[PDB]
Enzyme design. Sequence first.
Site, PDB file in Angstrom:
ATOM      1  N   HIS A  21      -2.382  -2.941  -3.500  1.00 39.40           N
ATOM      2  CA  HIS A  21      -3.614  -2.711  -3.055  1.00 39.40           C
ATOM      3  C   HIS A  21      -3.392  -1.195  -2.309  1.00 39.40           C
ATOM      4  CE1 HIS A  21      -6.743  -2.119   0.016  1.00 39.40           C
ATOM      5  NE2 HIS A  21      -7.480  -2.464  -1.029  1.00 39.40           N
ATOM      6  N   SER A  30       0.970  -1.235  -0.179  1.00 41.09           N
ATOM      7  CA  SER A  30       0.066   0.007   0.030  1.00 41.09           C
ATOM      8  C   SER A  30       0.765   1.239  -0.139  1.00 41.09           C
ATOM      9  CB  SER A  30      -0.889  -0.106   1.138  1.00 41.09           C
ATOM     10  OG  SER A  30      -1.632  -1.289   1.071  1.00 41.09           O
TER      11      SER A  30
END
Lengths: 170, 170, 170, 170, 170, 170, 170
Positions: free
Chosen positions: G104, G79
Amino acid sequence: ILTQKLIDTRTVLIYGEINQELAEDVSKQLLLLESISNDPITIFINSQGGHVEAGDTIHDMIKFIKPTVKVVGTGWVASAGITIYLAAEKENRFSLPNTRYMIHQPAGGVIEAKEIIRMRERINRLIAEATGQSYEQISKDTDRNFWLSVNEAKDYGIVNEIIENRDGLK
Amino acid sequence: ILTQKLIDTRTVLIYGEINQELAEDVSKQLLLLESISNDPITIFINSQGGHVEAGDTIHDMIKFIKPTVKVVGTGWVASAGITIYLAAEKENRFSLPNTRYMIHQPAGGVIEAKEIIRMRERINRLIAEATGQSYEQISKDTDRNFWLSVNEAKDYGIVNEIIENRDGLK
Amino acid sequence: ILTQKLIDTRTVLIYGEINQELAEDVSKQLLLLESISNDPITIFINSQGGHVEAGDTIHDMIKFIKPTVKVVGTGWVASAGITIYLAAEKENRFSLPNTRYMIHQPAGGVIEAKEIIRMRERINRLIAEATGQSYEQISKDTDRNFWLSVNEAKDYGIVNEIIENRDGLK
Amino acid sequence: ILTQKLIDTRTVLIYGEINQELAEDVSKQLLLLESISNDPITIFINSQGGHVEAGDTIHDMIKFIKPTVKVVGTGWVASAGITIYLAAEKENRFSLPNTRYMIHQPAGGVIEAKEIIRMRERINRLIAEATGQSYEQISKDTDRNFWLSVNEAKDYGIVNEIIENRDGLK
Amino acid sequence: ILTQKLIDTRTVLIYGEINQELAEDVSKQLLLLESISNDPITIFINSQGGHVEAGDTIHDMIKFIKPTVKVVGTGWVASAGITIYLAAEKENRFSLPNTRYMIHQPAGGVIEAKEIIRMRERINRLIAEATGQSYEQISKDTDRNFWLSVNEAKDYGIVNEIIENRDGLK
Amino acid sequence: ILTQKLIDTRTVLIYGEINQELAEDVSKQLLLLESISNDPITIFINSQGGHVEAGDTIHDMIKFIKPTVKVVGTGWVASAGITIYLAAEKENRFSLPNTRYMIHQPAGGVIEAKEIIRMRERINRLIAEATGQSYEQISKDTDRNFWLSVNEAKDYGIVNEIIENRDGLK
Amino acid sequence: ILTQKLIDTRTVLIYGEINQELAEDVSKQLLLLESISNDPITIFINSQGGHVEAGDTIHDMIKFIKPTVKVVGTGWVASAGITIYLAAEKENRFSLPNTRYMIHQPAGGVIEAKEIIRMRERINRLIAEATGQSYEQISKDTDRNFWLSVNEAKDYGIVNEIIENRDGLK
């Protein structure tokens, strides 16, 4: 100058609960003192015990380092604290007068039943070898809760010499 | 320079609860002062008491070290604090004027009944020997809660000399 | 250099609750300043009071040390704070203009009834001797809650001199 | 070197709640700066106020020390913060442009009714003398909650000079 | 001088939970020791395990640095602690006598099922390669909770040499 | 040597909530840097905003000190953070590429309605003057919640120059 | 001497949650290292991600400073941690063997829908440019939760070189 002269005394205090934090602090002190000289180290122990694995580390670190370690029991010495105390050779095990001793060991080590048994057998053998007591006597006494006076602890083979002053630690 | 000159006064303060943490701090100070010289050490005690085993350690450490220890009671001295106070020889036991004393000892030592009795007997004998009072008088007084004024504590054999100024601690 | 020159001012601040922690800090400062020289010490007091035994220690330590202690009341001086303030000799008791005073003493000392009475009698006599007020006047006033202005505190015999600038503390 | 040169600026910051802890910190800084030299001290104040007795101490300490104190209001200056701000002489009272002022004083001083009145009268007289406003105007305004802009605070007699840059604080 | 001589021992203690905080501390120590010299480093490990990603970092950092790393198991070595322990080459893996070992790995790594499987396969291969055990044996043993004695851990291929004194770590 | 060379960069970081604690820290840094030299100061700002009065102090302190202040927006700059950012002259206002901006101001300043209006008018005028936008445009935009990209913030008159490397801050 | 030699390694550790506190610490370290020399800096990253704005600051600071920055992924990089990792040029992006990667990105950035979209588009373009992947591939992958092995991350264009020892970071 202050902590430098505190290190010159070659003294380690083990007061309170035996845990991983205390084990780290004690390990660092013992390794530091070892690196300075081979001169003897004195450990004052006032402990109700704590975590078995932390007690094991301190016990083994005492035996691991090159300097001879003298122990002085004070206040109380119990459980994992007893395991640490018994790391020193018999003739190097001292006590201040106002001290009580208990060899009781917590079953869980404060884990399966097979491991509780293994742990108990290991600690029983350790205490038996250090005190000169039989395995059976130790096995009985680690599984009950009874306090020994300083004189009783001497008779038991835990304490070698009761001292009141500096000259007794010659 | 500041803490260095604070060490030059050879003074130790025992204020507040008697616990293992305080016992460690006091032990370190006493050992540090001992390593510097054999000159006398003055301890100011203001304590309601606390844990018996911590009191036992401080008591024994006072007697263990080579330097002569003078004690000065201030504010209050009670229970485990009394045990510590009585570690000094009678002629070295002083009090500031605004101080009260209580020899009451907690039954549990704040453990089986047999050990409560043993603990009480041990502390009773300690206090009896230090004060000059009979075992029976001490045994009665440790099991009740009564405060002694500074003058009453002197008459009891706890305090030897009441001092207001520096010249009294000659 | 910074704390070294802060020590050169020979000034101690007693701000906030009177407790054993503050008593230890103040005791250390007073003993440190005494060891340096016999020169006077100035104490600024802003306190609502606190624990009687801690107040007793600070009071007695002020009288115990060799240096002359001057006190300067500021903000408020109440209860155990008053006891500390009155440790200084009358001619050494000063106040900043924006200060109020209250001699009220907590019954429990924030213990049996007999000890509450003894404590009150002891503190009443202390305040009476320091202020020049009769025992009966002090006994009445310690058992009620009334604030004195700086001028009223001067008339009462608590404050000797009200000062606004440095030259007044000559 | 870093804090040493920070002390060379002779600047004190009073930011946040006025309490005994802040009063102690400010008192120490002012006494330290006084001991170094008689050179002027600049205080930047950003405070909503707090405890009356702590405000009284800081106010009086500002007037007590020998060095001339300049104050610079910034952000907000209210209540006990106003009392502190007004400790400086009128011609030494400055403000940064983005600042609001409120002379409202908490009734309890955040105690009996007679003491609330006495406290209010004392603070009212203090603010009246510092600003040049009548007692009646101040008495009305301390008992209500209204914010003054920097320009309104100047007209009121709180702020003497509004400054944006260093050259204005000549 | 104290921490400087502590660095001279080239010893790192990994005691307690394996987490990112410990991983950072250990990484810093290993990088610092590497920058000083290419001399060997000794790591004492007493750990129940913790977070897989923190264990992975410590494992990889041990292999990454130029100095040869010796490991000494003490008290207990389990889970993520085992992964770290096995970062050292087989002939550099030691144990103190009072130590137990467990290769159990937490399924979640204390995340989807596909990732649990991938993680397990990765760690299984790591442990298999380090110990000399088959993948199938490791796969069985990481998915159950059984403690190995120091002797069993030696037979398993985890521990190479059991040592009691300094001379064994030659 | 480490913090000394950190001071040599003449860089101040304003990261996180704008509060009185941060305002004090920033004020101290700016005053310290000013006392060292008149050389420019660079401020990196990553802030969602916070307390209006703390933002006002930092804004005004930036304009108050003699050294020229350059600002570099990074991550986000919003609300009270925008007020601080806009304290620097337009040609000294920079941004790193990955930054968003929001001029929304909290109504309460996170207080009566009349003061909410006054506060809003003051901040609206401040932002209008700094950006070159009309009062009406700013008044609309401070009372809604919309994020500007780095390019939009440049077009708005908040950011003057978008920089990726050191050479852009020449 | 210890931290001085730690600075000589020109190494920065980014372990744990990406937040404003970490961003400040990392910014200070990078600016300090830049001021010392133009020599390369190595960053070890073990992070699950955190706050988008903090990640943006660290990313941009890496690109802002003059020294060339090498990154070494370890444990996990996900992330906001991925955003930081990708700040280094492709040929300067390394990984330790036991590391997993996930691109993500949290929708809220852990804010209106229009801003969620803008944020996502910005980060998608950033990752696309750094990896060499198409916008469409990145857009799909940032909006789902799948872990890449070290080999898969290399094939994806995140990691350039997998290293086990020091000589690989030549």
